[PDB]
Symmetry: D2
């Protein structure tokens, strides 16, 4: 039903033993970094750009519009210091989240086998006996025996009980639990809007005026939720890409229809693991990546990729393989959440993420990858897709150092990225929206151009920029595509 | 040079959404659990057996012979309560380890940019300014600029300095550091024996008399180290399997020759990541697994697989994919270290490890896996290997529920396991060594038998045991191999 | 719709330049020889056996029961002189043939553009102006413009005309035309029974009492024609195999249903080329072979394979490739018609046919052939088919010199033959019908045995026969199958 | 050593039953026709053009320069009546032929077992007892026991004897033998120059002044023979292509080096079958085609393809499969010899040859063919070859109706032809040599153009010609290549 396969690797002793020698920003896999107090300064944001940050994620689960607007201003200043590293701006919606209230002493130590009751009144200041929940209809949604998870599942509670005003639970494990933590109610219908009023106002009064490029919509359940977001964006938001977050059972069941309506997908592994059991999450990840790859839809793999680096300067062995395998699975982007937003090693986390990406990208057999993609796609295809596919096959056959794509809307660049070239895709566009939105596709780096007139010289200009960025050198071949109906091969010579 | 590939997966909505319904011990991937105070009781050891523990690892980096012998006695009592779950016993050598001394207050808080000097005298009781190192020749081995890592790299120190008696370093990050922690000296020749006197006495005076089945030899660097271990074992230890641990550059460079001499391999990812940089470790893992798979040599993937479950009741998303990917890569065994030896959730860690294994095993396309193995092996092969390969292909072609292997030495079962059947391999043997040593191969479960006389009825007895264990039912086919030159297919009927 | 593929060949300079060194009867492709006056003597029939003849074809389009019974008697005497070369006996029905009458001077020279009329009265003795036709309803079946072909299309006539009693045609080419030649009426419904009274009496009063093994039924058009033949054979003829001849449009359209009812197929290329145009015949041949191969149904490729050797001692270059390509396409049998029945070089034709077969069989890559067959067959398959397939894969993996099959009905041998082993299939059977009927399957040679009791020694006896026939030698492996649920591999040793 | 494979076919009931509906000259396989008295008239030569003739073969084994010059003049008149069907002109050298002398009564009936002596004196007028041989050193080259074949092996003679002046042989079969027939001396070193004085004067005094495009050099044995022909052609003959004929053991042994020096190959099956035994010839054909295909060198399959049509209006079943299989093997050209030079049905033979080609070309799976070619060629390849390969893959992916190639020298067109597109390759060139020489490559049809200036409009002109030739229609896509570094895709629209 869902054939899923990692790219074959050719792993050499040289690659294992010889250190990496390329700029981190030469990587093909792109990185979404969540902003927060740990990277609030312009100086730290510039360091994250240099380490490999490509898209900035504003998590509207927390903070006010003024908090995010101040962050956005420091990002714009960081952008001015790296004007050719064009960052995409992503708004991540709160969605139908459920959270615990506040605590009498800010933290509580629940003990295993102890009782814990939760109350519908959100202004209660709780303690170890008692805590508030932001979901007013909690008593009517849970039936006895259901499990309640708090703080990314750091503690779980079995619903022994329910009444009109509250629920009684037994703590299934001991844990220290902080303020305002998330709660999951697996296998329970939660009566909250998928797109809330707050969500609609974050999209309309922040993402549109501020110029965000992506809406990452939480807990999406149907193709209709996506169509509603597109309709709210309206003509003024027509260039903002919709990225549904798949993090519950409904989003899995309806994934094919959600994907068809979407501009791309985020694999929201934290909530997904709490809604389906954790052992299943890798199945969902590899299947969504495979389906997105076949459709040419970009996908972001998210959550706990390098989690221990919130506290440690190096990741665990499982964290290393998680980043590499997400690359080898076919992800376009990988993501950091607390590792950049609130941890002690944000630059180090982005740095090692880029280094793992580079190792995983370098070991791939791109001949077999290309053949396996073409083997899995029905023909005839459109002229545009066939020319883009030939740019990739040609580049691999001669070991070209780049593919230059002239693209108004980005469509040509997306089609080339679908065929996963070993080399960088240098997309040229006159549209500001296009050069930032393309960041969600693997291997695409964009340059804003004034125009496409004199395609010969625009290509020769782009070749000049590529040599200046050390992406190509005398003796290299480059592929150029425009039209999407023309492909040219140019050898770089001494002039 | 090293083609490496994961098995293709067929991932269905049903598998993602429907809970697992099989006994945890029906899994094919086997689990090595490190014993320690967290699983010291007979009752907890019995729970680890039920959760999926197959091999018990005694880590001789710590503790005395009396400590390990007491543990061994509680394991034997746990074995008596699960007499048909025959556990393998593995001794893991200390090897040429380097460790910090003790501390004036048992713990120290090093601060970034602060100075730290280490001294050759191991009886010094250190503090934040000063710590002892067990390697007397530390000053003569490091030159200025080398990096010293302590406590699994939780802190790193740059060697600013060296003298006859000590080294001066600058702390590169702040960390709390405990007692007796390991130290790595990457890219430095350490002058310590690969097989120390202590190692030789642990092998000769504990593993041989106590009946251990495997020696996992630390920091192996050459085929000669393996030959020396085989020679020390001698005729009395001829049935003890040698498992080199690959955890340094020399072991990577000489891996092919080490493997040829070995009975199997342990991927020792903790030290390997500190000796080669962490971003490279996944390359080394996938290449060793691929080479071991092609040779029919069993491999154990080790270290930080479910690390956060030392403290948390559920693993991170990266930990889940790490176990599943190690299965999909082709590992025979996965391993737990502190998660079982000293953590707060040892039964839960083994339980979720088994559940991830079952999900990864279930999504594999075993048709493609079998074809890719036969495509990669030169023919003609031996009669024994060709019959074993046909048992697997036949079982897959008719969806047999098991392959029964009559085997004196285990050789037949190892050859069947090399071809990675979807079904369990039930190995019957009269040898006590064989039924425990086979635990390191994927999918092999053993039964001690009195004899092979009347092969018809020994097979019919094994069929009876398999129905009693719910491994097969009326209507199933089973494959039986013996000789290694005969294969029979038997349908289970009502009688 | 119909994927068709030749086996891949590995062609070496050694094979092109070094002469063949094996007995002609060691070939896997079997030969059907049509008997006639050119091989009427016992001595010539013995020479055809030695040259590679496996099945004797009695063409009931010509001759009386007494003529064929005398031939049959000389074949039985030839069989007594080669008692271990068990020949199959095939009756080829006349079917709804149409033939010209006799001639005033036995031959006529039609001239292009000259008129020629044909008359419904079969006793007319014709000449160049006028000839009789055995189909009484010729005038009512042809409409003006249809083409009439005579003597294997050596002349064609356009139907200019039709009346109640006759047809007028213009000769489209000049030709000398003999007595009693066949006529084709392409794209015209001929009103003759598919199974005529004469056919039913040849089957019932000759093939059943004489012990023929195959009925090759001419011009079969539907699965119902096959069912009628099976019903006429009845219980007394239950062991006689039905081989429909595909030689008209209806047989092509209904081929899948004809095949399902059939015991095998004959590609009757002479008539097929006249009913569909000649340029299409190779399409029909390769598609029927592919479908028969996938179903495990044996197929005979017939007609004009070595035609010029009716007159010349060596074949043309196109005749050589035709035999080799029919082998590489996957045919079980190839056939000779006038080359053995009436030509001047019958022993030479069978000899060179065998030599071409041996060259084509020797260049095949049997690894790829086996994989392509298993890739094209749905699983699960029956236990019997899976064991037979494993006998082939095992034999290829160790370069076994033969597969021994104990088979009552032949079913096991047919299943092994479906997977096209490089080595001979030695089928042992106690049934006289089985040991002769299996001759239509590629690579199967049979031995009549008294019994299967003591399977160990029956196999050891068959091994002894194989060494005596130089099919195996000390150092070889052989595969043995019986049950169909057991496979054994035996190495031949000095004893 | 020599992997050889036919293209996979997808054979449908529709193709078997529906008649061909395309112009014969739309075929991709090209036809070499040997000229002779049967096609001497301008009218018959025009009919052969319309039937599919692409290259005219002048066989200098027979006739004088005046005979061939008169033929050449009638070909030029036929060319003037079909000025857009640009024919290639091929001179086929006599080479070191051996022939019988003349006969007292022009024909002789040798009888099997009768004696026959041959004499070194070529003016002897022989009979059934005695015949002359053109090889003066026959007595010193044959030793007793060697076989002498005469008239394409229609009779063979065993050398019982040898003296200084003559040889005595026993006729091994009865045959009627005409005048001036060829003789083969298999496995005997013949002392004749590979390139004789007559050959050098036919090349220099006929092929160069008359404007022939190919020299088909008989009995080539080494790369040095090819280099000598290139040197004789010199600067004036630099545009004449050298096609060695492979027809003896030395040419097989040295085929790889001969091929490297050659512009293409002719498989000379008549002599090859007499020098190696006939059963081997199909091995040699399929291996040479495979090697030529991999190198991009065009190959002609020659001799006895439709032989019976020298006398019959329709071919045998083996002749049909021989043409189709030579196409499916990968031949660029197929050839007719006596079928056009001296037979009774020259237009019919060329017509049915074209029709078989069209059926074989239409059933090919061009997706698998393309992948199997790219799978078998080492990369990196040249920029030119990679762009040509992408023109083919793109055309197949969108079902383009043609590939337009702007080419000065033909190199671009040859590289496209190497990848065997399903569609026609329309090559445009300003060179007269190029537009005629390209005829030896499959699928290439050329147009002479004035210039390549304004590539946009030259392409739009070629598109206009293609619609006028019914090679493309509104709605089709076409591929255009020039540079070899640019590929464009153009959709044909209403204008
Ligand atoms: K959020
Ligand atoms: K250890
Ligand atoms: K017949
Ligand atoms: K010639
Ligand atoms: Mg979430
Ligand atoms: Mg270690
Ligand atoms: Mg017929
Ligand atoms: Mg010749």
């Amino acid at each position: 039903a869902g054939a899923s396969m990692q790219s074959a690797a050719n792993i050499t002793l040289r690659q294992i033993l010889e250190p990496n020698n390329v700029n981190l920003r030469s990587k093909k896999t792109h990185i979404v970094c969540t902003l927060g107090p740990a990277c609030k300064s312009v100086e730290t944001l510039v360091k994250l750009i240099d380490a490999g940050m490509d898209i900035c994620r504003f998590n509207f689960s927390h903070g006010s519009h003024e908090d995010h607007k101040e962050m956005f201003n420091n990002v714009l200043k960081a952008q001015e210091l790296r004007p050719n590293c064009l960052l995409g701006m992503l708004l991540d919606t709160k969605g139908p989240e459920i959270r615990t209230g506040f605590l009498k002493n800010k933290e509580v130590h629940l003990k295993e086998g102890s009782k814990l009751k939760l109350v519908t009144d959100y202004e209660f200041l709780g303690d170890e006996t008692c805590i508030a929940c932001s979901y007013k209809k909690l008593p009517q949604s849970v039936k006895p025996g259901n499990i309640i998870l708090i703080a990314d599942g750091s503690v779980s509670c079995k619903v022994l009980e329910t009444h009109e005003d509250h629920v009684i639970t037994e703590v299934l494990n001991s844990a220290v639990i902080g303020e305002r933590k998330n709660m999951n109610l697996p296998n329970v219908k939660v009566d909250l809007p998928i797109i809330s009023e707050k969500d609609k106002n974050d999209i309309l009064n922040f993402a549109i005026p501020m110029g965000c490029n992506f809406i990452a919509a939480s807990f999406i359940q149907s193709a209709d939720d996506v169509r509603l977001i597109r309709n709210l964006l309206g003509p003024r938001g027509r260039h903002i890409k919709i990225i549904p977050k798949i993090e519950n059972i409904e989003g899995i069941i309806h994934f094919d229809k959600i994907l068809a309506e979407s501009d791309g997908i985020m694999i929201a592994r934290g909530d997904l693991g709490m809604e389906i059991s954790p052992e299943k999450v890798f199945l969902a990840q590899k299947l969504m990546i495979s389906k997105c790859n076949l459709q040419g839809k970009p996908i972001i793999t998210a959550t706990q990729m390098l989690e221990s680096m919130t506290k440690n300067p190096r990741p665990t062995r499982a964290e290393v393989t998680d980043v590499a395998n997400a690359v080898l699975d076919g992800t376009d982007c990988v993501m950091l959440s607390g590792e950049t937003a609130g941890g002690k090693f944000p630059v180090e986390a982005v740095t090692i993420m880029s280094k793992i990406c580079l190792e995983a990208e370098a070991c791939i057999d791109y001949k077999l990858l290309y053949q396996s993609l073409v083997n899995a796609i029905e023909t005839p295809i459109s002229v545009q897709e066939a020319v883009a596919r030939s740019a990739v096959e040609t580049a691999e056959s001669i070991q070209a150092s780049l593919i230059i794509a002239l693209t108004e809307t980005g469509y040509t660049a997306r089609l080339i990225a679908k065929y996963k070239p070993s080399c960088t895709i240098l997309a040229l566009s006159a549209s500001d929206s296009t050069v930032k939105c393309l960041n969600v596709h693997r291997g695409v780096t964009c340059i804003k151009v004034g125009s496409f007139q004199g395609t010969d010289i625009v290509i020769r200009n782009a070749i000049e920029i590529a040599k200046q960025r050390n992406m190509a050198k005398v003796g290299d071949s480059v592929i150029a595509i425009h039209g999407t109906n023309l492909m040219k091969v140019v050898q770089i010579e001494l002039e």
